[PDB]
RNA sequence: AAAAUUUUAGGAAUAGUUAAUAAUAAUUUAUAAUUUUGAUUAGAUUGUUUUGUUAAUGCUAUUAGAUGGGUGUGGAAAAAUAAAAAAAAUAAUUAAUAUAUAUCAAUAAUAAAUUAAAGGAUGCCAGCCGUUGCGGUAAUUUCUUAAAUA
């Protein structure tokens, strides 16, 4: 029952903290990329002839 | 699907690839070779009071054909397939591996 | 250069399929490159996007690039209705400075969506102008000694609200009430000016709700109405009201001829069609102004096309046909029959498709187009177009298989619904912004009118002087 | 599809049964035609019909705003009706925008998935042959443009497979055949919550054998075995889907072994001694029901000798009714879903809790809930029009996970109900 | 002086303009971010191999505890330290 | 920030006010703001020189 | 409120009073649930008022 | 940048900028008070 | 907008004065009264002290409702509020417009607010009830507690008007939750005052002499309350000298009991024959015992002497 | 402006060409110029003591950039996109913001980026012999740190 309680608590905090962590994890990524790639314009240029 | 997969394509390295299956000998190969093409003259379902009654009328039948037809008909009655699925199953044909 | 991770295989070069900017512009109503070869009498739907519609693009919508002589079309703009705050001068601070308020067109929708997780909850009116409608309705709702018949006669209706002075208004109301007498509960619609109860002094005349309905893409100058007499304040803003005379609830009731084979299961099992209320056993038109209807509820407007516009379009299309067609096309079975796609055949196919669209949109009969108007929309009706109005009450779901056998009425699964003689009450179903009549271009003006010369400026000069001046930009 | 011009609106002017699009009519005009019920197919260009498709769907959504569940359902009905009137000739290769072998230029979503050179060289022919496997040229004179688009996307899956990025790592890809519903971004979120739950709760619970039912795409089965379970069985009513799931299980390496897919209805075969496939009572039975608009809405009783509920309630009742015969005594069944039923139709009672309290056959061991993160289409039928869920509805949508045990193992699970912060039912406390 | 201007980093008086002391950062999460006092042009040069004119120093925007507290403790020598080289 | 926390004990943990010397940080004090004087109905500040030193 | 992407005028109900508006820092301003641009605009307008520059600028939306 | 206070001369033009850039004589005077504090 | 005040009791005149003062001619002000001379006096006083917006004076609900957009009622009793809102022939909610807003600040029963809100919704208007708590001087200075219950968007529309005479305004929910909030607040105040009486009596029984320190001890410990922080300095003397009559206060036992008189009607059922309300009922017993002793209008600190009687009814009932 | 450092299993020719010139803008003069000391073209192809490895002057790896027909404008083409280098009034300067939160909208994870430490496989067989579609059979066996390596 103690193991079940620990698993329950872990899952509950996961469900609660899923939203804030994604915002934090996403932000760390946008702070480490020098230039983001405009795949839309790359594909438009590929189409152009 | 096998015919499309055999038709020419390009390798991951840009090489040309053509399997033998997309060739006239193996391309225009009819489905079956065994005599599994049978006739069922009558095949109907009637609702009695508390019972469904499926009548098959044919001159000869394949092994467990009646019972497998009943299985797929029960699936249809529960609403589990469609016209596309029936056509795919019918085109699949004989499966020699138990 | 951009970083790229090395790979021992071949790299794929996707060209992509984006949504065509031309299509987005066309639906938004902001395409200034399209030229329609054939002019038509059929409503044009456009969906306002982030307030990208303006006087400039709406002028072209009225007068298409093909070269037109008149706004001979109905123009439905889903959303696009704006609300303008009042303006006032700040004297405090460093000096006098105006504050104009602003237009909250895209920022404030007409109805918010009510999705709830736990008889459903829905909005049937526009919340911003619900309160301004409250005052107009309360002006009539009074049950005082002075009968509301005279109120509607004088204050409400103007000189001419429907099909043929002070005596004229009274005889019009008398005809309407006599017609409505035979029914225990009936209703009819009219165009009426704002009541004095809805104008408060400030000398600035403001509205009761503090908000004036407006469309920021209106071209031309608003209609001016006289009380010589002064101008009636907010006279261009008018109301189309429905007068009676003496949270929707859902409920579920207890073949495919276009196919060749027989389908194991129908492709489209169910239909859905809007439910409109019964019309008692009259239309209305404005021959002096161009009308912008702003519904406050969900309406169904049946627009009868004027014979003048119909003949204009027919004759102009046939003139184009004879000018450009060479008569070499011969006579195929149907226009889209395989053969050398001559310019004449292409043009004939264009006209055939246009006629097919017109006849499909129009009901089975002169020509009447049924238009579903919603709160938040704005419908532009030119001068001379007739129309009747009803209120839509909801939607149905019709078993296609059953309706193939007996009828849509019996084939119903679920229906969603929303709920002489004397005038018992009054509602307002739409605000009519009436504008002074737009110009009708003479033959020479139409011939020399070029849409390019109006892609930046000249709109207000066009609409003030009346049509484009011949010799506009040459000699 | 094959048309019958006699039942068409204007056969004398359009004897072919439809109105060809020369590529000039405004999309509002084409929309008016389709609303009046005419069939429209491109003349010589796929671009015209693609533009008409996109514009017509946008215009219909503008006409019928999603202000509540009832108008959402009505919008889906009307939008299916109209979208089933936008045809493309069965021999699409005749359209001049389909392929250009000299400029390696084309139109259509095929170049959102394949490079232009490969498409214009080799894959146009392979797609021509792929289509006939499902839509014979003999049988179909015309094709729906939604069918064309879904054929292209399923061809992309057949060629280069799909990828369930948040559920499975970058290195595992599946090839769901045409007509088997793939899994969208929103549809994964319930599976992400279930995967986290199982990752946390495989230890405390002696959870060894898992049975996933109606594992159409196989994503639930793959996620279960990934988070760790020695034995995984999946039961799907689609033989093609089980074939492909087994092939992809072979493909994904040795980490997915002892995953077995069988064709059958909701539950596996009942044999209990003749071949004895049973005696394999499972520690966990996983159900991830499909939630389409019609399935969620049109639900009620039917039948007089075998009365049965229809739609989402019917499926849930069948699952709850037939489970337990396959479940271990100390086993627990998990249902991962969304609150989209209680959003689409809040008037009628919530089915899971209705069963749990009114029926008194199962016991809520756990319930977890998590707001929906991404946006996209939900429970999409393969060959139907796309409908992405609007923002206001998405704000209310949630992912739910219900974990239930039998009332017979109430004594076994008694000590799990006794932890502080639990919600024991009235039966356990007695 | 471009037909389409760099909308997000406009400047004054064209390139490369006058030299300027800026406090340049690093493409790193704030948790490790540190600055460097550099002399550079008004229009940052990302073309030549010479990005800047002179490197004046470095600044650590994260306070550090006084490791030197025991050494001749003076008034409020235990307050956190902000390190900088100039 | 005790070193008994395995996330604070790691070499690359930023829960420190130093580097290369030790891990974590023993009990320390920091002063937050309480901008709620104005929540009170009557707030006043009295200016008086120190007297206790 | 002058900018179309800084709708400061939409959060009149996000503060209780003049002093509540003027005392809330950036962190509490974000916590109350305000976009980045509106948050920065409110903070900068408050600081300008503090420095002696009232919010007197021309609305550029039109 | 240059501040455009709400109370300087407005350009009643719908083909360009809605506020001119001139200023009331008070704004001229107060601007000096800011200029001088900057000059020190 | 046009905002009109109708209550004009003793606590309503400050609302009208504050609206007139802080309007600054930005919103129009209306005043209604049962007698015209009183409202003329009020308008004269407001203008003499400074009036920014023209003020109109009304004798009849018909003009009051058909002129103004917002109606604010600050009345004395539930019967007067019901008279103003529903049962009158020219009833405000009956003749309400499709969009006008009506707010009530008098403490009425949850069911009263129920009928008011239901009829307003029927007529299409929005009614939200905002019972007020505080002193008339608190209204003069502009401090009040308004706990409004009704539509959220209408409440947002009404924020600026409320702040002209209120400091702390909260939204308790939909369908007249403001009355429930006021009612529960009064019940909790009574219960805490009773508990403070118990604690101080027990301290005196135990024989701890320095109550100055014990007050800070309790305030810094758990179970502290403003009712203790208030009644302690008086209770200390009142228990050591039980002979002295408790002084009169503006907040009285009779006022607390009148405001608690809505609780019984707002609760579901009393036929269970048991009390699911131990502490609250015990406090009510002592309050009623104090009222029946001729000490109704005296201070809330008088519960000490009649707590012992607060057991007689518990034992007998 | 100049000096100097490149690759290819089947190794040869190159050219709007070299110098001189009272020649801007070459009607001229010459026994001109590149190349087996490996040129030209074609193929590969930004460079790149920063990478990795080792006892190793060996092997191995790499993204700073640049851009003769789109306005001749401009000091300079580098000009159709812009994690922001604050841009002519102190906008703001004790904040982790360098926000997505510029929140809706056709559109797909095909694709672009990033390494925390607040049970499967797998069949076979004449029943005196017609396409009756019975059985043997719940068929039995193979499946339950290495490869690449410095």
Distance D171 CA to J56 C1' (A): 40
Among all strands, which nt has the closest C1' to D391 (CA)? Answer: J104
Start-to-end CA distance of chain D, whole Å, equals 62
Whole-number Å distance between alpha carbons of D282 and D331: 7
Task: Please report how many Cα atoms fall inside a 13 Å half-sphere around the Cα of residue A46, on the Cβ side.
Answer: 22
DSSP 8-state symbol, C278: P
Distinct helix (H) and strand (E) counts, chain G:
3, 0
Judged by DSSP in three states, I104 sits in strand
Distance D297 CA to J40 C1' (A): 78
Using an 8 Å CB-CB cutoff, list chain A residues near D415: 1
Residues D67, C122: C-beta atoms closer than 8 Å = yes
Quote the distance between the C-alpha of residue C167 and its chain's center: 32
- CA separation (Å) from D260 to C257, D195, D249, D276? 44, 19, 9, 16
Using an 8 Å CB-CB cutoff, list chain G residues near C102: 59, 61-62
Q: Which nucleotides of J are covered by protein (CB under 7 A)?
A: 46-47, 62-67, 70-71, 73-93, 95-124, 131-134, 138-139, 144
- CA separation (Å) from C441 to C460, D169, I52? 15, 67, 55
Residues H26, C94: C-beta atoms closer than 8 Å = yes
Which residues contact residue C72 at a Cβ distance below 8 angstroms, ignoring those fewer than 6 apart? C39, C41, C309, C312, C313, C382
> Would you say the C-beta of E4 is within 7 Å of strand J?
yes
> Would you say the C-beta of G44 is within 7 Å of strand J?
yes
Whole-number Å distance between alpha carbons of D195 and D210: 13
Whole-number Å distance between alpha carbons of D49 and D58: 14
Residues G17, I156: C-beta atoms closer than 8 Å = no
Closest of E78, G27, E30 to residue F29, by C-alpha: E78
Distance C311 CA to J145 C1' (A): 89
Judged by DSSP in three states, I208 sits in coil
Q: How many CB pairs under 8 A join A and E?
A: 10
Closest of B34, B43, B31 to residue B90, by C-alpha: B31
Whole-number Å distance between alpha carbons of H26 and I184: 58
- Output phi, psi for D196, to 5 deg: -60, -45
Q: Does B84 touch chain D (CB under 8 A)?
A: yes
State the sign of the Cα–Cα–Cα–Cα dihedral C27, C31, C36, C42.
Answer: positive
Q: Does C87 touch chain G (CB under 8 A)?
A: no
Whole-number Å distance between alpha carbons of D241 and D182: 11
Judged by DSSP in three states, I292 sits in helix
Question: Is E79 exposed, middle or buried (CB count within 10 Å of its CB: 0-12, 13-18, 19+)?
Answer: exposed
Using an 8 Å CB-CB cutoff, list chain C residues near B86: 264
Which structure tokens are listed for C165? 């002075």
- Output phi, psi for I149, to 5 deg: -130, 120
Positions 38-67 of E with beta carbon below 7 A from strand J are 42-44, 46-49
Whether the CB-CB separation of C376 and C81 falls below 8 Å is answered with yes
Closest of I145, I161, I157 to residue I23, by C-alpha: I161
Whether the CB-CB separation of C384 and C285 falls below 8 Å is answered with yes
Distance D168 CA to J120 C1' (A): 22
Using an 8 Å CB-CB cutoff, list chain C residues near A34: 3
- CA separation (Å) from H40 to C242, D298, H35, H37? 72, 80, 9, 6
Among all strands, which nt has the closest C1' to E22 (CA)? Answer: J85
**Number of neighbours of residue C10 by Cβ within 10 angstroms:** 15
Q: What residues pair up with C252 in beta bridges, in sequence order?
A: C414
Q: Where are the alpha helices (DSSP H) in D109-144?
A: 116-118, 124-132
E strand or H helix at D199: helix D185-201
| Residue that has been written with the tokens 């009747």 in this structure | C388
Whether the CB-CB separation of D33 and C342 falls below 8 Å is answered with no
Judged by DSSP in three states, C457 sits in coil
The backbone region for C197, taken as left when phi is positive above 0, alpha when psi lies in -120 to 50, beta otherwise, is alpha
The backbone region for I147, taken as left when phi is positive above 0, alpha when psi lies in -120 to 50, beta otherwise, is beta
Q: What residues pair up with C47 in beta bridges, in sequence order?
A: C78
Q: Does H6 touch chain G (CB under 8 A)?
A: yes
Whether the CB-CB separation of D31 and D25 falls below 8 Å is answered with no
Is the N-terminal amide bond of G33 cis, ω within 30° of 0?
Answer: no
Distance H1 CA to J3 C1' (A): 52
Whole-number Å distance between alpha carbons of C285 and C295: 17
**Selected residues 3-62 of chain G with any CB under 8 Å from a CB in chain H:** 56-59, 62
Whether the CB-CB separation of C440 and C70 falls below 8 Å is answered with yes
* Best residue in D123, D128, D322, D384 for a mutation probing chain B (most B CBs within 10 Å): D123
| Residue that has been written with the tokens 């409109």 in this structure | C276
Which structure tokens are listed for C389? 């109005």
Which structure tokens are listed for I28? 């129009």
Whether the CB-CB separation of D345 and D386 falls below 8 Å is answered with no
Whole-number Å distance between alpha carbons of I69 and I152: 18
Burial I69-81 (b: 16+ CB within 10 A, else e): bbbbbbbeebebb
Whether the CB-CB separation of H5 and G57 falls below 8 Å is answered with yes
Whole-number Å distance between alpha carbons of D125 and D102: 15
Whole-number Å distance between alpha carbons of C378 and D281: 64
Residues D133, B4: C-beta atoms closer than 8 Å = yes
- Identify the closest residue of chain D to A49 by CA–CA distance: D103
Residues in chain F: 53
Query: What is the pairing mode between strands C386-399 and C299-304?
Result: antiparallel
Which structure tokens are listed for D361? 């056959």
Closest residue to J98 by CA to C1' distance?
A: A31
Whole-number Å distance between alpha carbons of D72 and D84: 18
Quote the distance between the C-alpha of residue B46 and its chain's center: 25
Which residues contact residue C259 at a Cβ distance below 8 angstroms, ignoring those fewer than 6 apart? C267, D1, D2, D3, D4
Which structure tokens are listed for D22? 């020369």
Closest of C212, C97, C85 to residue H5, by C-alpha: C97
Which structure tokens are listed for D268? 């596996």
Using an 8 Å CB-CB cutoff, list chain D residues near A49: 103, 105
Residues C102, G61: C-beta atoms closer than 8 Å = yes
What does C64-90 look like in DSSP terms, one character per residue?
-TT--SS--S-EEEES--EEE---EEE
Which structure tokens are listed for I191? 């219960």
The backbone region for H22, taken as left when phi is positive above 0, alpha when psi lies in -120 to 50, beta otherwise, is beta
Whole-number Å distance between alpha carbons of C461 and D229: 78
Closest of C267, C256, C239 to residue C152, by C-alpha: C239
Among all strands, which nt has the closest C1' to D183 (CA)? Answer: J109
Q: Which segments of C208-307 are extended strands (E)?
A: 212-214, 237-245, 249-252, 270-276, 290-295, 299-304
Whole-number Å distance between alpha carbons of C323 and C370: 34
- CA separation (Å) from H6 to C95, D176, G9, G11, H26? 9, 63, 17, 22, 13
Which structure tokens are listed for E40? 């550079």
Which structure tokens are listed for F35? 């901008």
| Residue that has been written with the tokens 């289409």 in this structure | D377
Query: What is the pairing mode between strands D19-21 and D40-42?
Result: parallel
Quote the distance between the C-alpha of residue I285 and its chain's center: 22
Whole-number Å distance between alpha carbons of C452 and D410: 81
Distance D374 CA to J64 C1' (A): 39
Closest of I155, I102, I134, I127 to residue I10, by C-alpha: I134
E strand or H helix at I127: strand I126-129
Q: Does G35 touch chain C (CB under 8 A)?
A: no
What does C368-416 look like in DSSP terms, one character per residue?
EEEEEE-TT-EEEE-TT-EEEEEEEEEEEEEEHHHHHHS-TTT--SEEE
Whole-number Å distance between alpha carbons of C360 and C369: 10
Judged by DSSP in three states, D259 sits in strand
DSSP 8-state symbol, I3: E
Query: What is the pairing mode between strands I132-133 and I145-149?
Result: antiparallel
Whether the CB-CB separation of D361 and D323 falls below 8 Å is answered with no
Judged by DSSP in three states, E38 sits in strand
Q: What residues pair up with E41 in beta bridges, in sequence order?
A: E19
Closest residue to J120 by CA to C1' distance?
A: D258
Residues G56, C93: C-beta atoms closer than 8 Å = yes
- Output phi, psi for D336, to 5 deg: -105, 125
Among all strands, which nt has the closest C1' to D160 (CA)? Answer: J110
Closest of C235, C186, C372 to residue C295, by C-alpha: C372
Whole-number Å distance between alpha carbons of C371 and C45: 10
DSSP 8-state symbol, G4: T
Whether the CB-CB separation of D218 and D288 falls below 8 Å is answered with no
Whole-number Å distance between alpha carbons of C108 and I315: 63
> Would you say the C-beta of G23 is within 7 Å of strand J?
no
Whether the CB-CB separation of I111 and I136 falls below 8 Å is answered with no
Which structure tokens are listed for C230? 């002064």
Contacts for E51-57 with beta carbons within 8 Å, 24 or more apart? E52/E24, E53/E19, E56/E21, E56/E86, E57/E84, E57/E85, E57/E86
Which residues contact residue C460 at a Cβ distance below 8 angstroms, ignoring those fewer than 6 apart? C55, H14
Using an 8 Å CB-CB cutoff, list chain G residues near F41: none
Q: What residues pair up with C399 in beta bridges, in sequence order?
A: C270
DSSP 8-state symbol, I301: G
Question: Is F48 exposed, middle or buried (CB count within 10 Å of its CB: 0-12, 13-18, 19+)?
Answer: exposed
Judged by DSSP in three states, D388 sits in strand
Whole-number Å distance between alpha carbons of D10 and D38: 9
- CA separation (Å) from I288 to D41, I197, I294? 86, 15, 10
| Residue that has been written with the tokens 């065994």 in this structure | B34
Using an 8 Å CB-CB cutoff, list chain I residues near G17: 163, 167
Closest of I87, C132, I177, I14 to residue I5, by C-alpha: I14
Whether the CB-CB separation of C29 and C73 falls below 8 Å is answered with no
Angle at alpha carbon of residue I201, lines to I199 and I205, rounded to 5°:
115
- CA separation (Å) from C365 to C280, C305, C361, I298? 19, 12, 12, 86
Which structure tokens are listed for B92? 């699949």
Which structure tokens are listed for D403? 């974990």
Q: Where are the alpha helices (DSSP H) in C105-188?
A: 130-141, 148-151, 166-180
Whole-number Å distance between alpha carbons of B52 and B47: 5
Q: Where are the alpha helices (DSSP H) in chain I?
A: 13-23, 36-48, 61-67, 78-82, 110-123, 136-141, 152-163, 177-206, 211-220, 226-240, 253-266, 278-290, 303-306, 309-316
State the sign of the Cα–Cα–Cα–Cα dihedral C358, C361, C363, C368.
Answer: negative
Query: What is the pairing mode between strands C368-373 and C299-304?
Result: antiparallel
Quote the distance between the C-alpha of residue F34 and its chain's center: 14
Task: Please report how many Cα atoms fall inside a 13 Å half-sphere around the Cα of residue D428, on the Cβ side.
Answer: 22
Distance E48 CA to J5 C1' (A): 22
Q: How was this structure determined?
A: cryo-EM
DSSP 8-state symbol, I223: T
Using an 8 Å CB-CB cutoff, list chain E residues near A31: 27-30
Which residues contact residue C281 at a Cβ distance below 8 angstroms, ignoring those fewer than 6 apart? none
- CA separation (Å) from E54 to E38, E50, E58? 6, 10, 12
Whole-number Å distance between alpha carbons of E80 and I238: 55
Rounded to a whole number, what is the distance in Å from the CA of G10 to chain I's nearest CA? Answer: 11
State the sign of the Cα–Cα–Cα–Cα dihedral C230, C234, C236, C238.
Answer: negative
Let me know if chains F and G touch, i.e. at least 3 Cβ pairs under 8 angstroms: yes
Whole-number Å distance between alpha carbons of G19 and G21: 5
Task: Please report how many Cα atoms fall inside a 13 Å half-sphere around the Cα of residue I54, on the Cβ side.
Answer: 3
Residues F18, E65: C-beta atoms closer than 8 Å = yes
Whether the CB-CB separation of I71 and I92 falls below 8 Å is answered with yes
> Would you say the C-beta of B67 is within 7 Å of strand J?
no
- Output phi, psi for C387, to 5 deg: -165, 145
Whole-number Å distance between alpha carbons of D266 and D315: 9
Which structure tokens are listed for C197? 């109860």
Rounded to a whole number, what is the distance in Å from the CA of C463 to chain D's nearest CA? Answer: 27
E strand or H helix at C417: strand C414-417
Q: Where are the alpha helices (DSSP H) in D272-378?
A: 293-297, 311-322, 340-344, 351-354
Using an 8 Å CB-CB cutoff, list chain A residues near C14: 43, 46
Start-to-end CA distance of chain C, whole Å, equals 54
Which structure tokens are listed for B50? 């508390």
Whole-number Å distance between alpha carbons of I200 and I206: 10
Closest of D269, D267, D219, D211 to residue D244, by C-alpha: D219
| Residue that has been written with the tokens 């299956």 in this structure | B21
Among all strands, which nt has the closest C1' to D59 (CA)? Answer: J106
Whole-number Å distance between alpha carbons of I6 and C78: 43
- Identify the closest residue of chain G to I168 by CA–CA distance: G16
- Output phi, psi for E73, to 5 deg: -55, 125
List of chains touching A (3+ CB pairs within 8 A): C, D, E
Pick from D193, D197, D371: which is nearest to A19 by CB?
D371
Closest of H32, H25, H34, H31 to residue H7, by C-alpha: H25
Closest residue to J100 by CA to C1' distance?
A: A23
Residues C265, B83: C-beta atoms closer than 8 Å = yes
Whole-number Å distance between alpha carbons of D76 and D69: 11
Whole-number Å distance between alpha carbons of D414 and B49: 47
Judged by DSSP in three states, E68 sits in coil
């Amino acid at each position: 029952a103690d193991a079940v309680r620990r698993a329950k608590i872990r899952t509950v905090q996961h469900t609660k903290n899923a939203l804030p962590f994604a915002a934090k994890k996403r932000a760390a990524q946008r702070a480490l990329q020098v230039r983001r790639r405009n795949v839309r314009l790359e594909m438009s240029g590929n189409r152009r002839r | 699907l096998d015919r499309a997969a055999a038709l020419p394509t390009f390798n991951e390295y840009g090489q040309r690839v053509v399997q033998p299956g997309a060739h006239g000998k193996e391309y225009y190969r009819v489905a079956t070779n065994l005599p599994t093409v049978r006739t069922v003259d009558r095949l109907d379902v009637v609702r009695q009071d508390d019972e469904v009654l499926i009548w098959f009328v044919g001159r000869s039948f394949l092994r467990h054909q009646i019972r497998n037809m009943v299985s797929v008909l029960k699936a249809a009655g529960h609403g589990l397939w469609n016209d596309l699925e029936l056509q795919q199953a019918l085109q699949s044909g004989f499966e020699p591996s138990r | 250069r951009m970083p790229r991770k090395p790979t021992p295989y071949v790299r794929k070069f996707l060209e992509g399929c984006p949504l065509p900017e031309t299509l987005v512009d066309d639906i938004a109503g902001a395409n200034l490159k399209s030229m329609a070869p054939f002019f038509t009498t059929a409503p044009r739907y456009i969906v306002a996007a982030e307030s990208r519609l303006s006087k400039l693009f709406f002028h072209h919508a009225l007068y298409p690039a093909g070269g037109a002589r008149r706004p001979c079309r109905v123009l439905i703009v889903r959303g696009g209705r704006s609300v303008r705050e009042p303006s006032f001068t700040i004297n405090t601070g460093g000096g006098r400075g105006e504050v104009g308020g602003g237009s909250r067109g895209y920022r404030d929708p007409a109805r918010r969506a009510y999705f709830y997780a736990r008889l459903v909850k829905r909005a049937s009116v526009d919340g911003l102008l619900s309160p301004l409608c409250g005052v107009i309705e309360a002006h009539f709702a009074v049950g005082g000694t002075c009968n509301d018949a005279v109120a509607t006669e004088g204050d409400g209706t103007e000189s001419l609200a429907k099909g043929g002075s002070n005596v004229r208004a009274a005889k019009r109301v008398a005809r309407l009430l006599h017609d409505a007498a035979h029914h225990l509960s009936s209703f009819f619609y009219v165009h009426t000016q704002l009541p004095d109860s809805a104008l408060f002094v400030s000398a600035v005349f403001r509205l009761a709700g503090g908000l004036e309905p407006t469309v920021h893409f209106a071209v031309g100058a608003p209609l001016s109405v006289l009380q010589s007499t002064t101008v009636l304040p907010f006279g261009h803003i008018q109301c189309l009201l429905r007068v009676r005379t003496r949270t929707p609830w859902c409920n579920t009731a207890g073949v495919e001829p276009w196919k060749l084979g027989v389908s194991l299961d129908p492709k489209v099992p169910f239909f859905m069609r809007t439910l409109t209320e019964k019309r008692p056993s009259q239309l209305l038109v404005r021959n002096d102004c161009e009308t912008y209807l702003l519904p406050q509820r969900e309406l169904l407007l049946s627009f009868h096309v004027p014979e003048e516009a119909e003949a204009m379009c027919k004759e102009q299309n046939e003139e184009r046909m004879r000018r450009q067609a060479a008569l070499g096309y011969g006579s195929p079975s149907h226009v889209f029959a395989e053969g050398p796609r001559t310019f004449a055949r292409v043009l004939h196919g264009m006209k055939a498709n246009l006629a097919a669209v017109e006849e499909a949109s129009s009901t089975f009969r002169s020509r009447v187009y049924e238009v579903r108007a919603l709160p938040g929309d704005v419908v532009f009706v030119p001068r001379g177009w007739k129309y009747s109005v009803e209120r839509i009450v909801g939607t149905a779901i019709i078993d296609a298989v059953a309706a193939s056998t007996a009828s849509p009425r019996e084939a119903l699964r679920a229906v969603f619904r929303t709920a002489n003689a004397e005038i018992v009450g009054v509602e307002v179903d739409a605000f009519v912004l009436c504008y002074k009549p737009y110009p009708v271009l003479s033959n020479a003006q139409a011939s020399t009118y070029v849409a390019a010369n109006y892609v930046h400026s000249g709109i207000d000069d066009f609409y003030a002087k009346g049509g484009n001046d011949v010799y506009h930009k040459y000699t | 599809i094959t048309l019958r011009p006699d039942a068409t609106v204007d056969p004398e002017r359009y004897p072919l049964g439809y109105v060809p699009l020369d590529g000039s009519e405004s999309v509002d005009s084409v929309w008016s035609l389709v609303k009046s019920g005419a069939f429209v197919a491109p003349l010589s260009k796929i671009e015209t019909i693609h533009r008409a498709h996109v514009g017509i769907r946008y215009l219909t959504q503008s006409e019928y705003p999603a202000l509540s569940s009832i108008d959402v359902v009505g919008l889906q009905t009307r939008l299916k009706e109209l979208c089933s009137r936008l045809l493309i000739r069965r021999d699409f290769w005749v359209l001049d925008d389909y392929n250009d072998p000299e400029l390696n230029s084309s139109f259509g979503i095929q170049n959102m998935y394949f490079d232009n050179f490969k498409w214009s060289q080799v894959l146009w022919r392979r797609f021509q042959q792929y289509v006939e496997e499902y839509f014979p040229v003999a049988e179909h004179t015309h094709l729906t443009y939604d069918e064309y688009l879904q054929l292209l996307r399923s061809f992309s899956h057949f060629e280069q497979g799909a990828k369930l990025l948040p559920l499975l790592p970058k290195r595992y890809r599946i090839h769901p055949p045409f007509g088997v519903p793939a899994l969208s971004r929103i549809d994964m979120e319930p599976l992400l919550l279930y995967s986290q739950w199982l990752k946390n709760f495989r230890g405390p619970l002696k959870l060894d054998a898992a049975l996933v039912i109606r594992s159409g795409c196989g994503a639930a089965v793959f996620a279960t075995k990934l988070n760790g379970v020695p034995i995984v069985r999946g039961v799907d009513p689609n033989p093609r889907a089980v074939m492909s799931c087994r092939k992809d299980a072979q493909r994904m390496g040795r980490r997915f072994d002892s995953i077995s897919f069988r064709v059958g209805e909701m539950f596996p075969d009942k044999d209990d001694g003749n071949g004895v496939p049973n005696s394999r009572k499972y520690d966990i039975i996983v159900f991830y029901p499909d939630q389409g608009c019609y399935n969620l809405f049109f639900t009620n009783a039917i039948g007089e000798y075998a009365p049965v509920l229809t739609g989402f309630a019917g499926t849930l009742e069948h699952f709850f009714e037939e489970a337990g015969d396959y479940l271990s005594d100390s086993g627990v069944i998990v249902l991962c879903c969304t609150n989209v039923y209680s959003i689409l139709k809040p008037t009628e009672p919530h089915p899971i809790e209705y069963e749990i309290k009114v029926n008194r056959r199962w016991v809520l061991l756990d319930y977890y809930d998590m707001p929906v993160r991404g946006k996209g289409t939900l429970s999409h039928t393969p060959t139907d029009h796309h409908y992405r869920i609007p923002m206001e509805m998405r704000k209310c949508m949630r992912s739910e996970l219900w974990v239930l045990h039998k009332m017979t193992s109430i004594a076994h699970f008694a000590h799990i109900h006794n932890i502080p912060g639990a919600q024991p039912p009235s039966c356990v406390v007695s | 002086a471009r037909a389409v201007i760099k909308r997000r980093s406009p400047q004054l008086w064209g390139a490369p303009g006058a030299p300027i002391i800026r406090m340049r950062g690093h493409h790193v999460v704030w948790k490790f971010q540190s600055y460097d006092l550099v002399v550079e042009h008004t229009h940052k040069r990302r073309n030549s191999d010479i990005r800047l004119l002179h490197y004046l120093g470095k600044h650590c925007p994260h306070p550090q505890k006084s490791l030197w507290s025991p050494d001749t403790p003076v008034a409020q020598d235990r307050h956190l330290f902000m390190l900088t080289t100039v | 920030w005790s070193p008994r926390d395995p996330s604070i004990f790691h070499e690359t943990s930023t829960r420190k006010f130093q580097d290369h010397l030790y891990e974590g940080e023993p009990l320390f004090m920091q002063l937050r703001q309480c901008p709620w004087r104005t929540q009170a109905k009557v707030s006043e500040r009295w200016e008086m020189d120190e007297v206790a030193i | 409120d002058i900018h179309r992407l800084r709708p400061t005028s939409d959060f009149k109900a996000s503060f209780k009073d003049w002093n509540d508006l003027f005392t809330c820092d950036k962190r509490q301003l974000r916590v109350r649930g305000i976009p980045r641009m509106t948050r920065d605009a409110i903070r900068t307008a408050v600081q300008a008022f503090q420095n002696g520059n009232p919010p007197e600028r021309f609305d550029t939306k039109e | 940048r240059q501040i455009r206070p709400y109370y300087n001369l407005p350009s009643k033009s719908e083909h360009g900028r809605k506020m001119t850039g001139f200023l009331t004589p008070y704004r001229h005077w107060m601007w000096k008070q800011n200029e001088l504090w900057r000059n020190v | 907008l046009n905002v009109g005040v109708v209550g004009m009791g003793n606590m309503g005149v400050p609302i009208a004065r504050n609206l007139g003062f802080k309007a600054r001619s930005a919103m129009y002000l209306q005043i209604h009264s049962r007698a015209l001379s009183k409202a003329k006096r009020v308008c004269d006083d407001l203008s003499v002290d400074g009036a920014t917006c023209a003020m109109r004076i009304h004798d009849r609900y018909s003009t009051m409702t058909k002129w103004c957009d917002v109606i604010v009622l600050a009345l004395a009793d539930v019967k007067a509020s019901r008279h103003a809102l529903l049962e009158d022939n020219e009833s405000l909610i009956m003749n309400a417009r499709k969009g006008q807003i009506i707010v009530d600040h008098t403490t009425v029963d949850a069911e009263t607010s129920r009928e008011c809100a239901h009829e307003a919704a029927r007529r299409g208007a929005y009614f939200l009830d905002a019972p007020m708590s505080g002193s008339p001087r608190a209204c003069f200075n502009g401090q009040l507690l308004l706990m409004v219950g009704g539509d959220a968007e209408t409440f947002q529309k009404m924020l600026p008007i409320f702040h002209m005479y209120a400091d702390n305004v909260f939204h308790m929910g939909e369908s007249g939750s403001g009355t429930a909030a006021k009612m529960i607040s009064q019940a909790l105040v009574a219960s805490h005052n009773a508990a403070a009486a118990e604690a101080l009596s027990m301290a005196h029984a135990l024989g701890i002499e320095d109550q100055s320190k014990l007050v800070q001890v309790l305030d810094a410990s758990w179970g502290s309350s403003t009712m203790l922080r208030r009644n302690a300095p008086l209770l200390q003397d009142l228990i050591r000298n039980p002979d002295k009559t408790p002084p009169t206060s503006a907040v009285s036992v009779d006022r607390l009991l009148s405001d608690l008189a809505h609780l019984d009607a707002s609760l579901p059922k009393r036929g269970g024959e048991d009390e699911p309300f131990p502490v609250f009922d015990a406090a009510l017993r002592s309050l009623a015992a104090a009222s029946d002793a001729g000490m109704g209008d005296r201070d809330l600190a008088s519960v000490v002497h009649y707590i012992e009687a607060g057991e007689a009814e518990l034992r007998n009932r």
